[PDB]
Amino acid sequence: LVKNKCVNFNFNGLTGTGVLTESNKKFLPFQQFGRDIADTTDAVRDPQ
Amino acid sequence: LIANQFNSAIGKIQDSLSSTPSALGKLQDVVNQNAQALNTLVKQLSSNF
Numbered sequence: 001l002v003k004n005k006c007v008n009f010n011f012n013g014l015t016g017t018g019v020l021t022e023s024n025k026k027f028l029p030f031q032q033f034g035r036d037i038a039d040t041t042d043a044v045r046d047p048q
Numbered sequence: 049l050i051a052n053q054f055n056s057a058i059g060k061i062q063d064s065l066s067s068t069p070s071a072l073g074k075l076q077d078v079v080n081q082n083a084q085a086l087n088t089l090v091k092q093l094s095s096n097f
């Protein structure tokens with residue numbers, strides 16, 4: 001896992017481009033993805 | 049008397065602006081229109097066309 005560097009991430013099918021940073025948001029145990037108002041990926045939980 | 053009326057009128061403006069939420073309707077409408085146009089433009093990427 002690499003943080004604070006612009007990389008290509010494939011977290012089981014996200015297949016998106018962006019820089020990954022630590023977040024204070026808390027997900028539900030079953031929840032994996034994250035979306036904003038515009039239905040764009042905003043935060044993803046590390047599978048490991 | 050005029051000084052007191054002026055002060056009380058400004059205080060009433062203070063109270064009316066603080067209480068009523070729809071006071072800044074023009075600015076809120078402009079901001080909402082711009083944000084909604086931006087949201088529609090962004091959502092247009094998800095359409096097949």
Ligand SMILES: *[C@@H]1O[C@H](CO)[C@@H](O)[C@H](O)[C@H]1NC(C)=O
Binds near residue numbers: 048
């Ligand atoms: C996933 O596997 C690694 C390697 O064995 C381990 O260090 C890690 O704790 C595992 N993840 C969880 C949530 O246990």
